C-alpha cells in the first residue's frame, strides 16, 4: 500500500533500499518462450521453442547469428534484442577489422554488461527487458553465458530461461554429470529432453516449433530449422509416462 510513491522511476530509492522498476523489468523475460543452453568438452548447443501460432502469419527468429563463433537466443522484448544484436555485431566487426583476431566471449559479455548498466541510473530511460543465452568457442574452449535486465551476467554449465523453465532447470541439474563426456548427438538429445519438459504432458516436439544452433572447435555457428531438425528429432524416444 505504501509502494505507490517509489515504483514509477528508476532513479528513486525505496525506504527499504530497493528499486522496483528493475524488478519489474526482470518480469518481462518470463513473457517469452523457453530456451535451453548446454555445453560439452568440445561443443556448445542452443535449442529454442517457438510459439504455437501458425507459421502462416509469423516467421520468428529466436536464434540469431552474431559472428563466426558466437550465437545467441532471445527471451523478452524484440526491439531490445535487435539493438543488442546490432551492438554485438558492430563490436565484433570492428575488432576483426582492426586486429585479425576473434573477440573473446568474456570481453564481449563485459562490454554488454557495461552498456546495459547505464539506463538503470539515468532519468528519462528504462532498463532493457530482454534476457540472452550466449554460446561461443575461443582459445579457452566452449562457453555458455546468461544475461539479465539488471545488467548482471553469469558463467554457466547449463541454463534455461523463459516461461515455465523451472522444469527444464530441474532436469538439467539432475542430469548435469554426464554432459562433459557426451558427443554432439547425445548433447543435442539431452537438450531436447530438457526443453520438452516445459510442455503439457501430452504434446511432443515436432519439426515445426524447434530451432537448434551449434558451434564447435571446427564447426562454425549454424542454425538448423524446419526439415534440417528431423535427423536430430528422429532418435528421441517417447515420454516416460
Amino acid at each position: 500500500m505504501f509502494r505507490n510513491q517509489y515504483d514509477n522511476d528508476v532513479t528513486v530509492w525505496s525506504p527499504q533500499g530497493r528499486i522496483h522498476q528493475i524488478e519489474y523489468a526482470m518480469e518481462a523475460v518470463k513473457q517469452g518462450s523457453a530456451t535451453v543452453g548446454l555445453k560439452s568438452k568440445t561443443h556448445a548447443v542452443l535449442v529454442a521453442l517457438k510459439r504455437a501460432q501458425s507459421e502462416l502469419a509469423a516467421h520468428q527468429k529466436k536464434i540469431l547469428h552474431v559472428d563466426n563463433h558466437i550465437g545467441i537466443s532471445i527471451a523478452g522484448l524484440t526491439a531490445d534484442a535487435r539493438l543488442l544484436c546490432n551492438f554485438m555485431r558492430q563490436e565484433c566487426l570492428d575488432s576483426r577489422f582492426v586486429f585479425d583476431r576473434p573477440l573473446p566471449v568474456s570481453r564481449l559479455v563485459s562490454l554488454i554488461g557495461s552498456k546495459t548498466q547505464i539506463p538503470t541510473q539515468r532519468y528519462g530511460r528504462r532498463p532493457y527487458g530482454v534476457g540472452l543465452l550466449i554460446a561461443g568457442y575461443d582459445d579457452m574452449g566452449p562457453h555458455i553465458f546468461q544475461t539479465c535486465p539488471s545488467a548482471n551476467y553469469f558463467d554457466c554449465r547449463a541454463m534455461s530461461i523463459g516461461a515455465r523453465s523451472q522444469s527444464a532447470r530441474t532436469y538439467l541439474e539432475r542430469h548435469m554429470s554426464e554432459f562433459m563426456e557426451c558427443n554432439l548427438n547425445e548433447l543435442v538429445k539431452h537438450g531436447l529432453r530438457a526443453l520438452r519438459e516445459t510442455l503439457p504432458a501430452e504434446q511432443d516436439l515436432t519439426t515445426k516449433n524447434v530451432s537448434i544452433g551449434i558451434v564447435g572447435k571446427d564447426l562454425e555457428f549454424t542454425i538448423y530449422d524446419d526439415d534440417d531438425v528431423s535427423p536430430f528429432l528422429e532418435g528421441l524416444e517417447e515420454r516416460p509416462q
Binding site: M1, Y24, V29, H59
Partner: protein, 229 residues
C-alpha cells in the same frame, strides 16, 4: 487491508508489476480503427488488397491513396493513422535512391524493411506510431512478404490480414491458403475474403489492388481491370 489506486499506463518508459508496457499496447489497439487489408505470398507474385472507405459521395474517390509504391520492385499497404506513414515512406525512398546512386542495383526487400524499421524505433517523436504496414516485392531470393506493427519491429510472413476485422479474415485465409497456388487464384481468394468482410458493395471504386510479380514492374490495377473481376 485497504483498497487503493495505482497507475502504470501513462508513460512509455514505465513497466507494469507484471512486466508490460501499456502505451505500446494501446498504440497497437489503435490499429483496429482502420480498414482491412490482405496480403498473400505466392511463388509467382505478391497480391496486395486494401479496403477504401468513403464517408460521403461528394468525396473524390481518387485521393485515398493507401497503396503507395516505392522503387526497387517494392509494394506497400497501410491501416491506421494515415498521416503517420509519410516519414517512413520518405526514409524508405531516400535509402533506396541512395543505394541506386551508390551501387547501381536494387536494394533487397529485407534491407529496405530493416532500414525503415530503424526509424520507427526512435521513440524510446515521443510516442509510437499508430499505423501498420505490409511490404511486397520479388528479388533473387524470390517473392517476399513482411509485416510491421506499432511496436517498431518487422516479421516475415506469407499470408497476413490487418485492419478492424482481421481475426475472421485470418481464420478464412488460413483455410483457403495452400502451399501452391496460381497468382490469379490468390487474387480471387483475396477478392472473396474482402467481399465477405466488407459491409457494402464491391464496385470498382471501393477497393485498390497492385499485384507485383517478377515479369514486369509495378502494376496497380486500373478501373477497367478491377471492373473485369
Amino acid at each position: 487491508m485497504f483498497l487503493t489506486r495505482s497507475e502504470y499506463d501513462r508513460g512509455v518508459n514505465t513497466f507494469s508489476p507484471e512486466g508490460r508496457l501499456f502505451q505500446v499496447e494501446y498504440a497497437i489497439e489503435a490499429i483496429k480503427l482502420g480498414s482491412t487489408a490482405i496480403g498473400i505470398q505466392t511463388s509467382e507474385g505478391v497480391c496486395l488488397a486494401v479496403e477504401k472507405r468513403i464517408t460521403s459521395p461528394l468525396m473524390e474517390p481518387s485521393s485515398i491513396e493507401k497503396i503507395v509504391e516505392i522503387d526497387a520492385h517494392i509494394g506497400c499497404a497501410m491501416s491506421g493513422l494515415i498521416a503517420d506513414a509519410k516519414t517512413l515512406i520518405d526514409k524508405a525512398r531516400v535509402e533506396t535512391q541512395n543505394h541506386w546512386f551508390t551501387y547501381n542495383e536494387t536494394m533487397t526487400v529485407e534491407s529496405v524493411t530493416q532500414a525503415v524499421s530503424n526509424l520507427a524505433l526512435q521513440f524510446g517523436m515521443s510516442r509510437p506510431f499508430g499505423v501498420a504496414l505490409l511490404f511486397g516485392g520479388v528479388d533473387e531470393k524470390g517473392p517476399q512478404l513482411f509485416h510491421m506493427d506499432p511496436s517498431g519491429t518487422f516479421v516475415q510472413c506469407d499470408a497476413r490480414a490487418i485492419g478492424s476485422a482481421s481475426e475472421g479474415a485470418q481464420s478464412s485465409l488460413q483455410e483457403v491458403y495452400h502451399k501452391s497456388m496460381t497468382l490469379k487464384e490468390a487474387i480471387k481468394s483475396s477478392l472473396i475474403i474482402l467481399k465477405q468482410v466488407m459491409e457494402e458493395k464491391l464496385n470498382a471504386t471501393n477497393i485498390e489492388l497492385a499485384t507485383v510479380q517478377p515479369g514486369q514492374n509495378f502494376h496497380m490495377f486500373t478501373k477497367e481491370e478491377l471492373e473485369e473481376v
